[PDB]
């Protein structure tokens, strides 16, 4: 446990809250763990009434996109969700499933959310998202957010809003996406695990140097359409994944050309360049087009700067539109270019990197020269969410 009073946050040059990507498997009983910190918060109040909105949501998606409606018992796992924040798990011993990504990413967007304003109250000179906000432009105060992966969400719902009431705003509008997007990547899992293919499976690979680098990359080439790069991690790491049915293959033959393999906790395809996904995609954010209830601040209106994962070396400029799509696309679609991100936000700089999240989330070869100012969220003491007063 690091105590905030050692971290010299006072002498930051800047902040960048990286926002993690949502790795983790977790059942009932060990995300009731982390779900009843928020559920006892003064969040309650502002959380609940997202949660409890989720099933219209769902049943706009499921006529939308009927193959992903029928794919997944979609409403029933979000009025679950209700009752479990609302009243407790209820069991967490009979019911021992791997839970899904439906209820999973609504869930870390929140986990992420909380510890990014106990984070402003563990560091606080109230309106604390106020307060980091109008204090932007002091010299050594400036902020940035940026999302990895699943990240994303969080990350532009902060960047998005300017105090309290809006951080709760667009705190909803990433609880909504999360859950649409899980819903995506639940029913094409499901609908892959019918078939031969046997659903998805996901590996961290690491390898040294150019050529054995080409020759993965030749590996994955050789298995299309099965396998792909989700993410560009490290100069030499990356995500791959891949069908169960190909994985065997996959595996063996990266081992072979001394590329180690590592099975990583994700579920489905993400940042996925399948047709399947590719339509599904389109048809979700052609109805988030319907809805001002899912959607973030226009790229021109951001309070805090914020990134894509697509390496550009500056946050996102100000012609860019609209965010909701862009989260979406990032997402479910575009490749995770998290090593020339990261690089990109990092490279002459020197600012204080503050993971929120269950996933380290600074690439090796980056870490090192960020040096002291640096934190992951979960190595910090006092760092429990406290309940509401009274």
């Known amino acids: 446990m690091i105590s905030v009073a050692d971290l010299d946050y006072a002498s930051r040059k800047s902040s960048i809250f990286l926002f993690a990507p949502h790795v983790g498997t977790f059942t009932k009983q060990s995300m009731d763990k982390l779900v009843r910190p928020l559920a006892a918060s003064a969040h309650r109040d502002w959380i609940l009434d997202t949660v409890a909105g989720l099933p219209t949501y769902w049943d706009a998606l499921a006529v939308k996109i009927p193959n992903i409606g029928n794919a997944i018992p979609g409403r029933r796992q979000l009025t679950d969700l209700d009752t479990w924040f609302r009243h407790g798990a209820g069991d967490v011993t009979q019911d ?122 030749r590996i994955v080439k050789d298995l299309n359409p099965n396998a792909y790069f989700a993410v560009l991690y490290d100069e030499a790491r990356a995500t791959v994944t891949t069908t169960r049915r190909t994985a065997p293959s996959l595996v063996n033959r990266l081992r072979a050309a001394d590329v180690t393999v590592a099975e990583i906790g994700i579920k489905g395809r993400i940042h996925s360049p399948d047709s399947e996904r590719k339509n599904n995609t389109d048809l979700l954010v052609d109805l988030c087009k319907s809805f001002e209830d899912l959607q973030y601040a226009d790229a021109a209106s951001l309070a805090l700067p914020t990134y894509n994962n697509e390496a550009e070396g500056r946050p996102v400029s100000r012609d860019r539109g609209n965010m909701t799509e862009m989260v979406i696309r990032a997402i479910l679609v575009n490749q995770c270019n998290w090593y020339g991100t990261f690089k990109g936000a990092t490279e002459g700089r020197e600012p204080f990197v503050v993971t929120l999240g269950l996933e380290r989330s600074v690439p090796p070869t980056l870490m090192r020269s960020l040096g002291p100012h640096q934190v992951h969220y979960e190595d910090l003491a006092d760092n429990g969410i406290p309940p509401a007063p009274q």
């Not at 791997?98 to 984070?119: A, C, E, H, K, N």
């Not at 940026?146 to 990240?151: D, E, H, N, R, V």
């Not at 990547?185 to 961290?204: C, L, M, N, P």
């Open 96 to 217: 021992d499933a791997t839970l899904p990504s439906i209820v999973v990413g609504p869930l870390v967007v929140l986990i992420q959310l909380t510890q990014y304003w106990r984070y402003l109250e563990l560091t606080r000179p109230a309106d604390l998202q106020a307060d980091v906000v109008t204090r932007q432009t002091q010299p050594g105060a400036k902020v940035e957010t940026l999302g990895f992966c699943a990240g994303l969400l969080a990350a532009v719902a902060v960047a998005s809003a300017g105090n309290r009431q809006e951080f709760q705003k667009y705190g909803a509008v990433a609880v909504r996406l999360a859950m649409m997007a899980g819903a995506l990547i639940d029913g094409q899992e499901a609908r892959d695990k019918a078939t031969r293919d046997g659903g998805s499976v996901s590996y961290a690979i690491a390898w040294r140097g150019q050529k054995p680098g080409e020759e993965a990359a």
